[PDB]
Amino acid sequence: ATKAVCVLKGDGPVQGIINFEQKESNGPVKVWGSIKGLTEGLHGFHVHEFGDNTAGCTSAGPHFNPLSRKHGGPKDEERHVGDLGNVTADKDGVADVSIEDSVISLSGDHCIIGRTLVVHEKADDLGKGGNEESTKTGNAGSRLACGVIGIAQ
Amino acid sequence: ATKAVCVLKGDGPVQGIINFEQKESNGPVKVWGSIKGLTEGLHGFHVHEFGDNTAGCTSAGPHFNPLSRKHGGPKDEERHVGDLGNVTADKDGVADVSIEDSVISLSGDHCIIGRTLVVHEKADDLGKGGNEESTKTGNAGSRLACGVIGIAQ
Ligand SMILES: [Cu+]
Ligand SMILES: [Cu+]
Ligand SMILES: [Zn+2]
Ligand SMILES: [Zn+2]
Hints:
The structure is a homodimer.
Chain A: E1 2-8, E2 15-22, E3 29-36, E4 41-48, E5 54-57, E6 83-89, E7 95-101, E8 116-120, E9 143-148, E10 150-151
Antiparallel strand pairs in A: 1-2, 1-10, 2-3, 3-7, 4-6, 4-8, 8-9
Bound molecules: copper (I) ion (CU1) (2 copies) and zinc ion (2 copies).
PDB class: oxidoreductase
Assembly: dimeric
Entry title: 2ME modified human SOD1
C-alpha cells in the first residue's frame, strides 16, 4: 500500500490535513481528513498540476489534466484527473472529508504526489455552468488553501 | 527536462526557495536558490524520507535512504540518497545555494518528488563525527525550515 498526506494552508483561516491511501496501483485512492475555517456549504476540491507554492496557491497552475479533457465532476468520464468535485463544510466551518476516487493515483501517469491539493472559495459547478470557465475550473473561485501532496509513512 | 521546487518554511526566521532541474533522467540534478534568516556558517541540507509536515519538520522522518547506507557527505560513496551536505550562510544570514548532484533524481523509482527538503541548525559533519548520530544525521541538529519537493513547470 501507498500513503500520501497534504497540509492545507493559505492567506486566510482555511487549514486542514488530508490523507491519501491506495492499497493497489490499479485500485481506488481513499481521501480523508478534516479542513476547518471554511464558510458553510460547498467548496471546490482539486489536484492542481504543479507542486509550486512560490507565489502561494496561484503558482500551482491549472487542474491536473494529463489526458487533456474538459473539467467535470469526479463521476464524469469527461473530467480532469485532478477533479475531486466539492467538499462540504458544516455550520462550524469544518469539512469532514471522505472521498474515494479511481482516477487519481499515488503512482504512474495519474500520480498526484508532488502536485498541489487546493480547496476553493465557491462550489465547483462540475462543468455544468454553461460558460467556458465552467469547462476549466468549475467556477470554483479563489484558492483559499493549498499544500503539496507528500509521500507519507 | 524535469523541474521541481521547494518552499522552505519553519517556526523561526529561516525561509527560502530551492529549485531543482534535471536535463536528462540519467543525468545530474542542479539544485539552486536562496535561504535567509540563518546564522553565518554551515548548515546541514538534506532530503528527508517523508513529505509529511503534519507535525512540522519533525514528521519528515529521517534522511531519505532507499539504499540503506550510512550517513555521508555528497561526495562520499557511502551516503544516504538525501545527503546534500552543507549550505553556507553569509554575514547577513543568507545562503546562496548552488549544488550539482548525481545521486538524487527527479524521476524513477527512487525520485525525491514528494519528499521533504530540510535545512538545519548546525553543520553536517559528513558522517565523520565519531559518534552514532554522525552515522545517521551528521549531527546537524534541529530542523529550522522544510518544505515538500513539488513538480514545477
Ligand atoms: Cu482547484
Ligand atoms: Cu536533514
Ligand atoms: Zn478540473
Ligand atoms: Zn544522511
